Paper text:
The Rho protein, a homolog of Ras, is a member of the Ras superfamily of small [name]. Rho family proteins are involved in cytoskeletal organization, cell mobility, and polarity, and are implicated in cancer morphogenesis. Like other Ras-like [name], Rho [name] can switch between inactive GDP-bound and active GTP-bound forms through the actions of guanine nucleotide exchange factors (GEFs), GTPase-activating proteins (GAPs), and guanine nucleotide dissociation inhibitors (GDIs). The Rho family was delineated from the rest because of its unique insert region between the conserved G4 and G5 boxes, which is absent among other GTPase families.
Residue numbers in the entry:
A (entry chain B): 4 to 180
B (entry chain A): 4 to 62, 65 to 180
């Protein structure tokens, strides 16, 4: 009953905080590690209990260089972007998919919109306005998930604790095959 | 944008009515065929419309049924809540067959006729053979022994859970 998850995506898109809120239940306000230490989550699906190992990744000198070594013996990949950063969504299609297809190909991919709480925030809307950009819409997000062939598209906010459980329960359902 | 689903399970467990209610929108009371005509449903997932081909099966049917398995993406193994025997056959008959012919595919275990779980006449009939309607726990346990992708319960008669069954199968079929 054991499975492995790897989470990847642009720096600062919210990967580590998402794992921490799911695992520990509280958003980390001051200290955030670069990568969440490996942890085994208990996830209940259809009455069954599976242990899900959470493998966080980064792009910081050596963490970037070592990241391909996380994919072996994986069962599900989370590709993340931040709703307040359309640039991080462009890299989902540009950089991250190319990596997963190079290293994994046959694993299910969940596409995860992180920081969903920033979607309607005026300060972000004004900043993105300057380049004629907007926070990512569910439409655009679901559209990129299809383009990259993902298993599911999900949105979440670590900060408000919205949608976090659904990400990991879904990812676990995909991992069980 | 196309996927194929095959539905299997004991005769009269509710396979054909489930497809008709999902496809056509009305529970079939006048005419019910042994197997529904092959039909392609539109199912929306994550904003995407996918065409889901529905392949009904029966038991000159116990022998021709394997010709439905090629090119499937998802299998529904069905039983009826008012028939624990049909749940017993999931493992004794149906799981070995789908793995013999398909092996690669996600499997959903689907409790059908869920509207009968609390029907008094049903409960008394099963009492006479020391049985009771299948519980959620009893179904989930078989879904576990079967390594199934999902366990779902539904009632075609009343429509509870029907949409969710086919939306889940489509999500599974995209693997
Ligand atoms: N508004 C908002 N900010 C977030 C959320 N999750 C993370 N952040 C912030 O994004 C920054 C980077 O987050 P982090 O988890 O370290 O991103 P990572 O590099 O992918 O691990 C930090 O300042 C977090 O406080 C969220 O759900 N909402
Ligand atoms: N109570 C109840 N009866 C049902 C339901 N679905 C089918 N039936 C009945 O089960 C019998 C056989 O149904 P059918 O769809 O032909 O089962 P199949 O042999 O698996 O194709 C018929 O009398 C149906 O009306 C349901 O959801 N609830
Ligand atoms: Mg990080
Ligand atoms: Mg029939």
């Amino acid at each position: 009953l054991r499975r492995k998850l790897v989470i990847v995506g642009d720096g600062a898109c919210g990967k580590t905080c998402l794992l921490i809120v799911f695992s520990k239940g509280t958003f980390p306000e001051v200290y955030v590690p670069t990568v969440f230490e490996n942890y085994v989550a208990d996830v209940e699906v259809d009455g069954r209990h599976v242990e899900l190992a959470l493998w966080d990744t980064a792009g910081q000198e050596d963490y970037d260089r070592l990241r391909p070594l996380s994919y072996p013996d994986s069962h599900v990949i989370l590709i993340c972007f931040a709703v307040d950063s359309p640039d991080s969504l462009d890299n989902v299609q540009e950089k991250w998919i190319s990596e997963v297809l190079h290293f994994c190909s046959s694993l299910p991919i969940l596409l995860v919109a992180c920081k969903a709480d920033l979607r309607n925030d005026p300060k972000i809307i004004e900043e993105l306005s300057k380049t004629n950009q907007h926070p990512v819409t569910t439409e655009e997000g679901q559209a990129v998930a299809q383009k990259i062939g993902a298993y599911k598209y999900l949105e979440c906010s670590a900060k408000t604790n919205e949608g976090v459980r659904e990400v990991f329960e879904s990812a676990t359902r995909a991992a069980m095959l």
